[PDB]
Amino acid sequence: AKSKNHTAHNQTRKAHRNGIKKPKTYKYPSLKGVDAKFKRNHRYALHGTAKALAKARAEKSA
Amino acid sequence: KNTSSKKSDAAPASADPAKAKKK
Amino acid sequence: GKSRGYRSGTRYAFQRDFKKHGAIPLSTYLKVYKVGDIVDIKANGSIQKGMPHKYYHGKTGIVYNVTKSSVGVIINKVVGNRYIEKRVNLRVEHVKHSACRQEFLNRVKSNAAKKREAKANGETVYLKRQAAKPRGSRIISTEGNIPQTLAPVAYETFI
Amino acid sequence: MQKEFRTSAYHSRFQTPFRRRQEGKTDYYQRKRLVTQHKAKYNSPKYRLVVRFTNKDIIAQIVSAHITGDVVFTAAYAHELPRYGIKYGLTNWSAAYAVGLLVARRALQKLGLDETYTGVEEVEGEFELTEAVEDGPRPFKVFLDIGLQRTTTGARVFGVLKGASDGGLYVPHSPNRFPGWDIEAEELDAELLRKYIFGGHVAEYMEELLDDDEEKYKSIFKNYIEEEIESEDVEEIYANAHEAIRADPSFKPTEKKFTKEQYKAESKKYRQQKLTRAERQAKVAKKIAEFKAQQE
Amino acid sequence: ARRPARCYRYCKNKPYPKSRYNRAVPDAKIRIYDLGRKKATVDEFPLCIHLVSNELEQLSSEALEAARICANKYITKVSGRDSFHLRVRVHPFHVLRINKMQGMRGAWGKPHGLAARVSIGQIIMSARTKDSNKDVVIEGLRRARYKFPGQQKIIISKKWGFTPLNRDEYIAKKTNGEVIDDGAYVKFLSRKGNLEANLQQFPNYQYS
Amino acid sequence: KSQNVMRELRIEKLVLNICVGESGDRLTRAAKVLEQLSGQTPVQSKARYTVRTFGIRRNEKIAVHVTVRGPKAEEILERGLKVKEYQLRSKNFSATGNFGFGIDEHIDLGIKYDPSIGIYGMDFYVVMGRAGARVTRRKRARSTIGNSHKTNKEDTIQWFKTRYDAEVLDK
RNA sequence: GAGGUAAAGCGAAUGAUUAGAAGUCUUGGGGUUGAAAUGACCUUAACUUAUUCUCAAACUUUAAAUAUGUAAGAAGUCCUUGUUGCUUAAUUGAACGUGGACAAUUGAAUGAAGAGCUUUUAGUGGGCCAUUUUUGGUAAGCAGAACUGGCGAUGCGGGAUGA
RNA sequence: CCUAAGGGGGACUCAUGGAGAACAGAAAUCUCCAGUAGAACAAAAGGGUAAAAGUCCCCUUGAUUUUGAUUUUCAGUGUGAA
RNA sequence: GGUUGCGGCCAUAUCUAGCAGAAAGCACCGUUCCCCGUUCGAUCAACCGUAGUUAAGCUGCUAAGAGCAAUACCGAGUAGUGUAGUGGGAGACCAUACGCGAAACUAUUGUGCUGCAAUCU
Ligand SMILES: [Mg+2]
Ligand SMILES: [Mg+2]
Ligand SMILES: [Mg+2]
Ligand SMILES: [Mg+2]
Ligand SMILES: [Mg+2]
Ligand SMILES: [Mg+2]
Ligand SMILES: [Mg+2]
Ligand SMILES: [Mg+2]
Ligand SMILES: [Mg+2]
Ligand SMILES: [Mg+2]
Ligand SMILES: [Mg+2]
Ligand SMILES: [Mg+2]
Ligand SMILES: [Mg+2]
Ligand SMILES: [Mg+2]
Ligand SMILES: [Mg+2]
Ligand SMILES: [Mg+2]
Ligand SMILES: [Mg+2]
Ligand SMILES: [Mg+2]
Ligand SMILES: [Mg+2]
Ligand SMILES: [Mg+2]
Ligand SMILES: [Mg+2]
Ligand SMILES: [Mg+2]
Ligand SMILES: [Mg+2]
Ligand SMILES: [Mg+2]
Ligand SMILES: [Mg+2]
Ligand SMILES: [Mg+2]
Ligand SMILES: [Mg+2]
Ligand SMILES: [Mg+2]
Ligand SMILES: [Mg+2]
Ligand SMILES: [Mg+2]
Ligand SMILES: [Mg+2]
Ligand SMILES: [Mg+2]
Ligand SMILES: [Mg+2]
Ligand SMILES: [Mg+2]
Ligand SMILES: [Mg+2]
Ligand SMILES: [Mg+2]
Ligand SMILES: [Mg+2]
Ligand SMILES: [Mg+2]
Ligand SMILES: [Mg+2]
Ligand SMILES: [Mg+2]
Ligand SMILES: [Mg+2]
Ligand SMILES: [Mg+2]
Ligand SMILES: [Mg+2]
Ligand SMILES: [Mg+2]
Ligand SMILES: [Mg+2]
Ligand SMILES: [Mg+2]
Ligand SMILES: [Mg+2]
Ligand SMILES: [Mg+2]
Ligand SMILES: [Mg+2]
Ligand SMILES: [Mg+2]
Ligand SMILES: [Mg+2]
Ligand SMILES: [Mg+2]
Ligand SMILES: [Mg+2]
Ligand SMILES: [Mg+2]
Ligand SMILES: [Mg+2]
Ligand SMILES: [Mg+2]
Ligand SMILES: [Mg+2]
Ligand SMILES: [Mg+2]
Ligand SMILES: [Mg+2]
Ligand SMILES: [Mg+2]
Ligand SMILES: [Mg+2]
Known part of the structure; x- marks a missing residue:
């Protein structure tokens, strides 16, 4: 039979109708793949930070 | 006792260049 | 037979620079x-x-x-009509700090210094960068520089 | 007829090694393994115990490496030993032990870890590592850097090792390179190591040589003869030196007979200075004219 | 056997030289590139005449051999075998391919012949001779022009023989002791390097 | 100054080679001869490759050699020069200032003959050098030797003639 | 920041390649001197040295144009000191933070019938042409790739006529 | 294809050329000097490698256990490999 | 300023051939009982600093030096190239327009700078 093998013609036309969109940025990136040892300890540091801020505001309320 | 160690690397030599007859 | 291995076509990309082979200078590891x-x-x-x-x-x-x-580095790669977030683990020998930070971080400092100085002097200063503008008027002195007349030269063969 | 090898293309394509490798002074393989720090410890440095031997001196330095160059923390030289009571044999194995003890104590003085981490105060030659104190700062960790010097059981670099370990520094090591290690029966004869710490081998050489060759004893051990120092009081020379080193390990610089400017002015008088371009052009012109006498 | 040259006139393919990748390549028909009195010194033949290509084109080794023979025959017949030094300035290094010697399947050809790829303004043949032999040498090259496809110009060089200096700069460098013989060519003095070797090589150097 | 104490020529090493063409008992007896002469256990050299014409094969123990330094080297050297009756050739000296000769029977040196051992010829090579060659052989800061301090053919020839009252031919 | 294509280079590496010249104790040979030396001479051929003509998709020091990664702030910069079981010899750092300062020229241009998000489903999955880059082939209204623009799916004015 | 040709450490420096040493010669072994890699690294080719990744020596089993994250091909599925 | 130890950048530092080097340092240098390694205390190990030397290393200077580095009314706005035309030419190819723009060549200049610690006529 024998047919067309490959062509990238018209493929950039299709990608640019609705795409070529830069990804959105967020304030907090996901920590997926971040070192487990750092991630394990970072959990305790954040928990303790919330306690200190909670007590400081609890002082400034009652 | 003791023997000389192979400082060289011509592992698959078993012969040498330049060693041409009639020379 | 088609070949499409991991390092295909990297004959020159992955070459060391000329007369720069061998040991890594240790600032790379510091x-x-x-x-x-x-x-x-x-x-x-x-x-x-x-x-x-x-x-x-x-x-x-x-x-x-x-x-x-x-270090793990985040790269945005085009896959069709969108970007996909890529997370690549790289030894520090293949990594160098980007020099684009140091120019912008200095312009931030310069803008902050200029603003406070104008604030100190009670005047105003404009911090936005400008593209190169067309040049102004000017006067060309001809003392020692009287115009020399040129003409197109005839054709010659030099072989 | 063979091809000349040293062509201009050979020099053009030649890639010179690192400057300090071409000097044959730095093993950059070993330097990379020693210096490089875990990237998740960021700016915490690794500390090296640099130990170098010259023909007359022992140099021990505590160094951390940086991009602008290495930075010395403290340094003890063997030529500091006469201040502590050791005047001769400034390259013994025992002088190495003394230098290691001095640098350990001096570093701990600089840090403030004197009362904590005293070290091995009663040197019996037993293998021991500086253990951390509970509910307190960990001992100053330092890694041994012996440079290009070969690793042999009995080498002098490990004398500085034992001194630094005994001085209170935490220096990770094994005892199978100390003098007195039986390789067949893998245990350390601590008696012979203690012998080596207090110059026992040198004293035994003095005693063994004295009754077998008095003339050689007179030439080799001159300084001992004019000081009337025998073998039996060598140990005290070290035991006192040890004590003095622990009493005041601080660095005292030598009072300089001349100022920096005077030294610089004196040295600047010698050493030829490069010729101006015009001078060498005149030299070239003279050589051309003076070449005219071999025209045949 | 050999196709007409019209099949290989244009540089349609990339250069295909003999290499470790094609080995069964025939030899070029041209093997001799210097003719006449090739051992003559530079001072003997001041006049240089070039045959220059005005085409980006391929010239076969067969054509090079034929044109070389034609020019050599004419000039030695008319002026004598020792009145000139002829040099062919293009070497055929590009391998042409032939397919038939089914259909288009597996159509990669076999080496068939050799051609030199010449550019516009590229010199094909250079002839150094004396001035009095100008009209002979020109007519020798003009006949050789007939053996080539495309357009070629016969250009009288401004330079002395095969040297890169004009016919006036060569005389200046000659009376200044800056030129020495090297057989058929010359060596020029350098103001760089070992001064003693430079002075030894050029004793007659009037230094300024 | 050319007349410096440290510029003194003196022997660096003497190397004794017996290249018996085969392996086994004969090579062992040549090694016995060498260990007898030098008092040190010699070392056997293996063929780098196979040659059928010479009857050798790769890694077959062919030759044996030993290196001697110091007074024993001096004694062996003069013992061998006695056999040569103190007469070498100019061609016996290399461009690097080393020299060598070859004896043909090892009983001429002055050792006891054993019928079991037999006689082996022997090859002598002396490596010359001044003081300070340790620069080129030490591990740290290895460097090269200056031109005046280098050993060459003429200095070695003159030193040999002076120290042994021998003759250096040139046939 | 990356790149190794165009160009360029070969008295620069690698590979190919024309020509002489001067030299050397394995010169490769012929003749002559040799009593014969193998020690000269005439010669050709080898190499070495400094040169010379011409080349490379799967060669290369150098090295574009076009094209390509990132950045140009309020989620920024700086100051102080809270959390941790991580890290440091540490009171060192790491990350996340409290509190404070820097106000519309809040940190290039131009544009923006606004930006962002979701679900679901059709047809299609034979293509072809033009310029330029480009492969096989002698070539082809031939076969095959690169980027773009078109025809297909498109009428209208021009090319008489013609996707 | 490989219990090392895997892993660690240590010592040394290859291809080749020149000048020399009984038999010994173009090729045996020995010595010095030169030697940017012109070698070697299982197998195609490219890249990489010199106090080594090459040669030699010592000790070993990380060629092990639990499973996640990531890269290439990619639909951002599988497999292989990292 | 010299020198040593440890370095950063990694030839403006390398290579060749000469010449010079006060002080200290470094070095060569002396020895083999001891730990240790060798065919060989040559390398490696250890001891003495005692007997000697700047001969060498190292350092500096010299060279129309090789190489390397930098610069440019050098070559050259050349080669190449993005973009354009119902431009030229049978073609091969070429000119023009708006832009970007080499390499070789040529000439000139230079030949390590520097951080921490210690020390010195
Ligand atoms: Mg079909
Ligand atoms: Mg299809
Ligand atoms: Mg091998
Ligand atoms: Mg195939
Ligand atoms: Mg393929
Ligand atoms: Mg690259
Ligand atoms: Mg303002
Ligand atoms: Mg370098
Ligand atoms: Mg090591
Ligand atoms: Mg084609
Ligand atoms: Mg023909
Ligand atoms: Mg024609
Ligand atoms: Mg045999
Ligand atoms: Mg490519
Ligand atoms: Mg080209
Ligand atoms: Mg090209
Ligand atoms: Mg070029
Ligand atoms: Mg003849
Ligand atoms: Mg604080
Ligand atoms: Mg805040
Ligand atoms: Mg701007
Ligand atoms: Mg959808
Ligand atoms: Mg659908
Ligand atoms: Mg759909
Ligand atoms: Mg469907
Ligand atoms: Mg669908
Ligand atoms: Mg179809
Ligand atoms: Mg269909
Ligand atoms: Mg179109
Ligand atoms: Mg066009
Ligand atoms: Mg097609
Ligand atoms: Mg078809
Ligand atoms: Mg259709
Ligand atoms: Mg339409
Ligand atoms: Mg119409
Ligand atoms: Mg028409
Ligand atoms: Mg129409
Ligand atoms: Mg391996
Ligand atoms: Mg292994
Ligand atoms: Mg290994
Ligand atoms: Mg190793
Ligand atoms: Mg497995
Ligand atoms: Mg990866
Ligand atoms: Mg697949
Ligand atoms: Mg996947
Ligand atoms: Mg996928
Ligand atoms: Mg998978
Ligand atoms: Mg996968
Ligand atoms: Mg691996
Ligand atoms: Mg100054
Ligand atoms: Mg001195
Ligand atoms: Mg010794
Ligand atoms: Mg030693
Ligand atoms: Mg000196
Ligand atoms: Mg000197
Ligand atoms: Mg120069
Ligand atoms: Mg110069
Ligand atoms: Mg154009
Ligand atoms: Mg166009
Ligand atoms: Mg028209
Ligand atoms: Mg233009």
């Missing part, structure tokens, strides 16, 4: 990378572990993870 740093990626052919794929050779990205000998 640099400190922090999460959020912008780094250029350039594969060193003499270190094969933690080596980037040929796509990331010449790309710039953000460090997201720091390990014993490596």
Whole structure:
């Protein structure tokens, strides 16, 4: 039979109708793949930070 | 006792260049 | 037979620079990378572990993870009509701090210094950069520089 | 007829090694393994115990490496030993032990870890590592850097090792390179190591040589003869030196007979200075004219 | 056997030289590139005449051999075998391919012949001779022009023989002791390097 | 100054080679001869490659050689020069200032003959050098030797003639 | 920041390649001197040295144009000191933070019938042409790739006529 | 294809040329000097490698256990490999 | 300023051939009982600093030096190239327009700078 093998013609036309969109940025990136040892300890540091801020505001309320 | 160690690397030599007859 | 291996077509990309083969200068191992740093990626052919794929050779990205000998860098790669977030683990031999930070971080300092100085002097200063503008009027002195007349030259053969 | 090898293309394509490798002074393989720090410890440095031997001196330095160059923390030289009571044999194995003890104590003085981490105060030659104190700062960790010097059981570099370990520094090591290690029966004869710490081998050489060759004893051990120092009081020389080193390990610089400017002015008088371009052009012109006498 | 040259006139393919990748390549028909009195000194033949290509084109080794023979025959017949030094300035290094010697399947050809790829303004043949032999040498090259496809110009060089200096700069460098013989060519003095070797090589150097 | 104490020529090493063409008992007896002469256990050299014409094969123990230094080297050297009756050739000296000769029977040196051992010829090579060659052989800071301090053919020839009252031919 | 294509280079590496010249104790040979030396001479051929003509998709020091990664702030910069079981010899750092300062020229241009997001489903999955880059082939209204623009799916004015 | 040709450490420096040493010659072994790699690294080719990744020596089993994250091909599925 | 130890950049530092080097340092240098390694205390190990030397290393200077580095009314706005035309030419190819723009060549200049610690006529 024998047919067309490959062509990238018209493929950039299709990608640019609705795409070529830069990804959105967020304030907090996901920590997926971040070192487990750092991630394990970072959990305790954040928990303790919330306690200190909670007590400081609890002082400034009652 | 003791023997000389192979400082060289011509592992698959078993012969040498330049060693041409009639020379 | 088609060939499409991991390092195909990297004959010159992964070559060491001319007269620059051999041991790595140790400032490479003394640099400190922090999460959020912008780094250029350039594969060193003499270190094969933690080596980037040929796509990331010449790309710039953000460090997201720091390990014993490596950093994780986030790259945005075009796949069709959108970007996909890529997370590449690279040994620090293939990584260098991006020089684009130091120009902008200095302009921030210069703008802050200029603003306070104008604030100190009670005047105003404009900090936005401007593109190069067309040049103004000017007067050309001809003392010692009387115009010399040129003409197109005839054709000659020099062989 | 063979090809000349040293062509201009050979020099053009030649890639010179690192400057300090071409000097044959730095093993950059070993330097990379020693210096490089875990990237997740960021700016915490690794500390090296640099130990170098010259023909007359022992140099021990505590160094951390940086991009602008290495930075010395403290340094003890063997030529500091006469201040502590050791005047001769400034390259013994025991002088190495003394230098290691001095640098350990001096570093701990600089840090403030004197009362904590005293070290091995009663040197019996037993293998021991500086253990951390509970509920307190960990001992100053230092890694041994012997440079290009070969690793042999009995080498002098490990004398500085034992001194630094005994001085209170935490220096990770094994005892199978100390003098007195039986390789067949893998245990350390601590008696012979203690012998080596207090110059026992040198004293035994003095005693063994004295009754077998008095003339050689007179030439080799001159300084001992004019000081009337025998073998039996060598140990005290070290035991006192040890005590003095622990009493005041601080660095005292030598009072300089001249100022920096005077030294610089004196040295600047010698050493030829490069010729101006015009001078060498005149030299070239003279050589051309003076070449005219071989025209045949 | 051999196709007409019209099949290989244009540089349609990349250069295909003999290499470790094609080995069964025939030899070029041209093997001799210097003719006449090739051992003559530079001062003997001041006049240089070039045959220059005005085409980006391929010239076969067969054509090079034929044109070389034609020019050599004419000039030695008319002026004598020792009145000139002829040099062919293009070497055929590009291998042409032939397919038939089914259909288009597996059509990669076999080496068939050799051609030199010449550019516009590239010199094909250079002839150094004396001035009095100008009209002979020109007519020798003009006949050789007939053996080539495309357009070629016969250009009288401004330079002395095969040297890169004009016919006036060569005389200046000659009376200044800056030129020495090297057989058929010359060596020029350098103001760089070992001064003693330079002075030894040029004793007659009037230094300024 | 050319007349410096440290510029003194003196022997660096003497190397004794017996290249018996085969392996086994004969090579062992040549090694016995060498260990007898030098008092040190010699070392056997293996063929780098195979040659059928010479009857050798790769890694077959062919030759044996030993290196001697110091007074024993001096004694062996003069013992061998006695056999040569103190007469070498100019061609016996290399461009690097080393020299060598070859004896043909090892009983001429002055050792006891054993029918079991037999007689082996022997090859002598002396490596010359001044003081300070340790620069080129030490591990740290290895460097090269200056031209005046280098050993050459003429200095070695003159030193040999002076120290042994021998003759250096040139046939 | 990355790149190794165009160009360029070969008295620069590698590979190919024309020509002489001067030299050397394995010169490769012929003749002559040799009593014969193998020690000269005439010669050709080898190499070496400084040169010379011409080349490379799977060669290369150098090295574009076009094209390509990142950045140009309020999620920024700086100051102080809280959390941790991580890290440091540490009171060192790491990450996340409290509190404070820097106000519309809040940190290039130009544009923006606004930006962002989701679900679901059709047809299609034979293509072809033009310029330029380009492969096989002698070539082809031939076969095959690169980027773009078109025809297909498109009428209208021009090319008489013609996707 | 490989219990090392895997892993660690240590010592040394290859291809080749020149000048020399009984038999010994173009090729045996020995010595010095030169030697940017012109070698070697299982197998195609490219890259990489010199106080080594090459040669030699010592000790070993990380060619092990639990499973996650990531890169290439990619639909951002699988497999292989890292 | 010299020198040593440890370095950063990694030839403006390398290579060749000469010449010079006060002080200290470094070095060669002396020895083999001891730990240790060798065919060989040559390398490696250890001892003495005692007997000697700047001969060498190292350092500096010299060279129309090789190489390397930098610069440019050098070559050259050349080669190449993005973009354009119902431009030229049978073609091969070429000119023009708006832009970008080499390499070789030529000439000139230079030949390590520098951080921490210690020390010195
Ligand atoms: Mg079909
Ligand atoms: Mg299809
Ligand atoms: Mg091998
Ligand atoms: Mg195939
Ligand atoms: Mg393929
Ligand atoms: Mg590259
Ligand atoms: Mg691997
Ligand atoms: Mg990867
Ligand atoms: Mg303002
Ligand atoms: Mg370098
Ligand atoms: Mg090591
Ligand atoms: Mg084609
Ligand atoms: Mg023909
Ligand atoms: Mg024609
Ligand atoms: Mg035999
Ligand atoms: Mg490519
Ligand atoms: Mg080209
Ligand atoms: Mg090209
Ligand atoms: Mg070029
Ligand atoms: Mg003849
Ligand atoms: Mg605080
Ligand atoms: Mg805040
Ligand atoms: Mg702007
Ligand atoms: Mg959808
Ligand atoms: Mg659908
Ligand atoms: Mg759909
Ligand atoms: Mg459907
Ligand atoms: Mg569908
Ligand atoms: Mg179809
Ligand atoms: Mg269909
Ligand atoms: Mg179109
Ligand atoms: Mg056109
Ligand atoms: Mg087609
Ligand atoms: Mg078809
Ligand atoms: Mg249709
Ligand atoms: Mg339409
Ligand atoms: Mg119409
Ligand atoms: Mg028409
Ligand atoms: Mg129409
Ligand atoms: Mg391996
Ligand atoms: Mg192994
Ligand atoms: Mg190994
Ligand atoms: Mg190793
Ligand atoms: Mg397995
Ligand atoms: Mg697949
Ligand atoms: Mg996947
Ligand atoms: Mg996928
Ligand atoms: Mg998978
Ligand atoms: Mg996969
Ligand atoms: Mg100054
Ligand atoms: Mg002195
Ligand atoms: Mg010794
Ligand atoms: Mg030693
Ligand atoms: Mg000196
Ligand atoms: Mg001197
Ligand atoms: Mg120069
Ligand atoms: Mg110069
Ligand atoms: Mg154009
Ligand atoms: Mg166009
Ligand atoms: Mg028209
Ligand atoms: Mg233009």
